[PDB]
Design a protein around this ligand. Structure first.
Ligand SMILES: C/C(=C\CC/C(C)=C/CC[C@]1(C)CCc2cc(O)cc(C)c2O1)CC/C=C(\C)C(=O)O
Ligand SMILES: C/C(=C\CC/C(C)=C/CC[C@]1(C)CCc2cc(O)cc(C)c2O1)CC/C=C(\C)C(=O)O
Length: 272
């Protein structure tokens, strides 16, 4: 069974390092998101976008567009989501640099792990900002309803729904930021990504993160012995969400020309 030894003290040290770096890299933590979503925050309520009227009032309220603002609502929303995804790529990149051993990997491998990892991490962390009713946007200053997003014309009405479906089930696991910091690191350090140069050093880092994660979960969740196994299952699930997402982006690229795909996202999508 579980032991207090030097190995376990090192794994707890790693968990703390990752948590501290995760806090630094991602201002809106799950703890803060949940406080807003339950109202248990003392902060001002987010502005709620639940219909076309409150979307347009929202554009006046929420600050975070030359011929962008000429496009129909669904495209303005979709383009906004793309920009926020690119900001998320930047943050997740900075987080990865804090993962011990990551910056010592060959720079091409660092880039490959991020290329194939970032969307998995985006869907994981998006769950922190979701409840069954909607999602927090612009770092908690807004809340956009799930049914409002579904109401957008085909094919835009379907692009968030699979992320909500993932989030309701993921959120039932009741992970906290301390758990997530390690989970995200595990996903990034996946040795099976296409086109990696040096698989073994990545596998060696991931093995240590997986040990850190299993110990964190045993300590932090006395009421489930299944949680580690369930989280390995979520890692495979996320690869499905991303596949499905990419196919939707194809359908959009094919059917919905006169609508710009962010060049950086194009680069990432190339070989997913
Ligand atoms: C999934 C999505 C938007 C990502 C929105 C988003 C910001 C997700 C990441 C959530 C985290 C990582 C949570 C923590 C956090 C804290 C911050 O302080 C700031 C941000 C951005 C943040 O983002 C729309 C569909 C994808 C598109 C168009 C694409 O890809 O084609
Ligand atoms: C659903 C989603 C982003 C909506 C992005 C959005 C506000 C789209 C609407 C864009 C338009 C129609 C265009 C101009 C504009 C500017 C604003 O400043 C505010 C709004 C509402 C706005 O609306 C992904 C999750 C985002 C997170 C966590 C975040 O961390 O964001």
């Amino acid at each position: 069974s579980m032991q207090l030894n030097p190995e376990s003290a090192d794994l707890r040290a790693l968990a703390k390092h990752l948590y501290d770096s995760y806090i630094k890299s991602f201002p809106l933590t799950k703890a803060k998101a949940r406080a807003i979503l339950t109202g248990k925050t003392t902060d001002k309520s987010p502005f709620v976008i639940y219909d076309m009227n409150s979307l347009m009032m929202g554009e006046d309220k929420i600050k975070f567009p030359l011929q962008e603002q000429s496009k129909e609502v669904a495209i303005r929303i979709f383009q906004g989501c793309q920009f926020r995804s690119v900001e998320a790529v930047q943050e997740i990149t900075e987080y990865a640099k804090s993962i011990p051993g990551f910056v010592n990997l060959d720079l091409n491998d660092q880039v490959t792990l991020l290329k194939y990892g970032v969307h998995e991490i985006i869907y994981t962390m998006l769950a922190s900002l979701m409840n069954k009713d909607g999602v927090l946007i612009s770092e908690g200053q807004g809340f956009m309803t799930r049914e409002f997003l579904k109401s957008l014309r085909k094919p835009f009405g379907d692009f968030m729904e699979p992320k909500f479906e993932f989030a309701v089930k993921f959120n039932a696991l009741e992970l906290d930021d301390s758990d997530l910091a390690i989970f995200i690191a595990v996903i990034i350090l996946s040795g099976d990504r296409p086109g990696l140069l040096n698989v073994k050093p990545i596998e060696d880092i991931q093995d240590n993160l997986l040990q850190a994660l299993e110990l964190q979960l045993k300590l932090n969740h006395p009421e489930s012995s299944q949680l580690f196994a369930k989280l390995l299952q979520k890692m495979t699930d996320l690869r499905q969400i991303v596949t499905e997402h990419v196919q939707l982006l194809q359908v959009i690229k094919k059917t919905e020309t006169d609508m710009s795909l962010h060049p950086l996202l194009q680069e990432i999508y190339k070989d997913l």
